[PDB]
């Protein structure tokens, strides 16, 4: 599980998730798993999907996780009233918008990249698509 090594403040406000994404082209690799839905992704979903990919295209290839969590999500325990402070940091999410290339892959044929990205897009909560490295 991914999590920043050392923050600056422990608890972040909710804020909103509007507009489109910045990481949009397949930059590092050759094939990409790009988001279409909005959503947000916990570190467990990123790890689950990465294991599905790494298993699927065996220890050949090279995989880039282009998103990183760095946003702490706090929850209140059970049978605790409202108020009395902000909750506790339970997990860490990345906020996703439509357009984020969530993962990249290189060093495989396209048909294995289809296969691993299908296998791993079923571990994520957002609708997802397959993209290739377009040249300009």
């Amino acid at each position: 599980m991914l999590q920043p090594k050392r923050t600056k403040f422990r608890k972040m406000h909710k804020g909103r998730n509007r507009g489109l994404a910045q990481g949009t082209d397949v930059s590092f690799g050759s094939f990409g798993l790009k988001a279409v839905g909005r959503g947000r992704l916990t570190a467990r979903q990123i790890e689950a999907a990465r294991r599905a990919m790494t298993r699927a295209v065996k220890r050949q290839g090279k995989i880039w996780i282009r998103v990183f969590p760095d946003k702490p999500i706090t929850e209140k325990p059970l049978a605790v009233r409202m108020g009395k402070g902000k909750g506790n940091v339970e997990y860490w999410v990345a906020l996703i918008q439509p357009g984020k290339v969530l993962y990249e892959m290189d060093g495989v044929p396209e048909e294995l990249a289809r296969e691993a990205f299908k296998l791993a897009a079923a571990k994520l909560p957002i609708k997802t698509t397959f993209v290739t490295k377009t040249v300009m």
Binding site: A35, V36, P98, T134, M136
Partner: peptide, 10 residues
């Protein structure tokens, strides 16, 4: 000559 293309995001 095609200088630079803005594509739709998704």
């Amino acid at each position: 000559k095609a200088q630079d293309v803005q594509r739709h995001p998704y």
